Design a protein around this nucleic acid. Structure first.
Ligand SMILES: [Zn+2]
Ligand SMILES: [Zn+2]
Ligand SMILES: [Zn+2]
Ligand SMILES: [Zn+2]
Lengths: 72, 70
DNA sequence: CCAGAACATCATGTTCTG
DNA sequence: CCAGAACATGATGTTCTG
């Protein structure tokens, strides 16, 4: 098996340049195309795992960027 | 005038406390649903009009600290 | 005016299609 | 295999109903 570089769930494949799970793949594509602006309610360092990833879009988006996801 | 939980514009006195509509229904569903809420932070999230949706654990906790019940 | 239900929209995740 | 669209669903918020 292989892990999502963003949320540590089971990766489904290489998406947007990075190993990710399906949910993170479509989250990113949705985050980079739409207007959302996200606000972190903690300290910009929220725990993004399978359980908590939808708590903080802001921190999930940032982790997406830091892993190097991009549309091409 | 301001929701004690999220500082959004309150609507009336709900469950003991001046809160907004969204907080009223969140609180009732919280208590009467008993979901496993988990904070992604340190159990001290900021809860305002936007951030209240981020962390229902902290939101439900702040409701309690405000005095909401029944 | 307020509680509870009903409705409407959000946000997310799986599945399908190209 | 991967991207983009379509579908499915549970959480949130507003409106109606008692
Ligand atoms: Zn992921
Ligand atoms: Zn965060
Ligand atoms: Zn509120
Ligand atoms: Zn929290």
């Amino acid at each position: 098996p292989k892990l999502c570089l963003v949320c540590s769930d089971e990766a489904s494949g290489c998406h947007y340049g990075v190993l990710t799970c399906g949910s993170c793949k479509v989250f990113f594509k949705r985050a980079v195309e739409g207007q959302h602006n996200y606000l972190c309610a903690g300290r910009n360092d929220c725990i993004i795992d399978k359980i908590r990833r939808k708590n903080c879009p802001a921190c999930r988006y940032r982790k997406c960027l830091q892993a190097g996801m991009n549309l091409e």
